[PDB]
């Protein structure tokens, strides 16, 4: 389908990060899934480069690839983690969950 934010739940144990992230056991990270087909909707905040590349790809699919659906604003989460064996509270662990998808 078209580029949009979709659910993606991360379990820290599944990727081995529970060795140092004490809490929470996981969180809703989301992901950006879908194609960026011309014309690029304005809520996907396309750049001029993405628009031009999308146009060239339309004319010749081997000269340029499609623009890509990627996160454009990320949000922090709060965690507890081990710092030298000491459980500490990190208020804004930045860049962890998608708030906005975009075409780039």
């Amino acid at each position: 389908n078209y580029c949009k934010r979709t659910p993606l739940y991360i379990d820290f144990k599944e990727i081995g990060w529970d060795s140092w992230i004490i809490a929470p056991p996981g969180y809703e990270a989301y992901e950006c899934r879908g194609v960026c087909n011309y014309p690029l909707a304005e809520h996907l905040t396309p750049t001029k480069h993405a628009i031009i590349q999308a146009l060239v790809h339309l004319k010749n699919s081997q000269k340029a690839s499609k623009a890509c659906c990627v996160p454009t604003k990320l949000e922090p989460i709060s965690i507890l983690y081990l710092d030298k064996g000491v459980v500490t509270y990190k208020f804004k662990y930045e860049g962890m969950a998608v708030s906005e998808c975009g075409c780039r």
Binding site: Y2, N37, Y38, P39, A41, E42, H43, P46, K48, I51, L55, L58, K59, N60, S61
Partner: protein, 76 residues
Amino acid sequence: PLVTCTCESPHCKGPTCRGAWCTVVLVREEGRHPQEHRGCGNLHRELCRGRPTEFVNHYCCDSHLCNHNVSLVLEA
């Protein structure tokens, strides 16, 4: 000053939208049949200004529902 436009595309939350101008975009992707999109524009007014090509054609207008049943053609 915004204008109300017919909305007819995968990205529409309803039958109309409001924006600075109304749009129709005709797109032919390689190997497929040309597909028509109708909506509103607020950024990238310059897209309105491009010459039609074999693969794309833009139309923009700024009257109430001015894009409702406009139909475009592509270059040969």
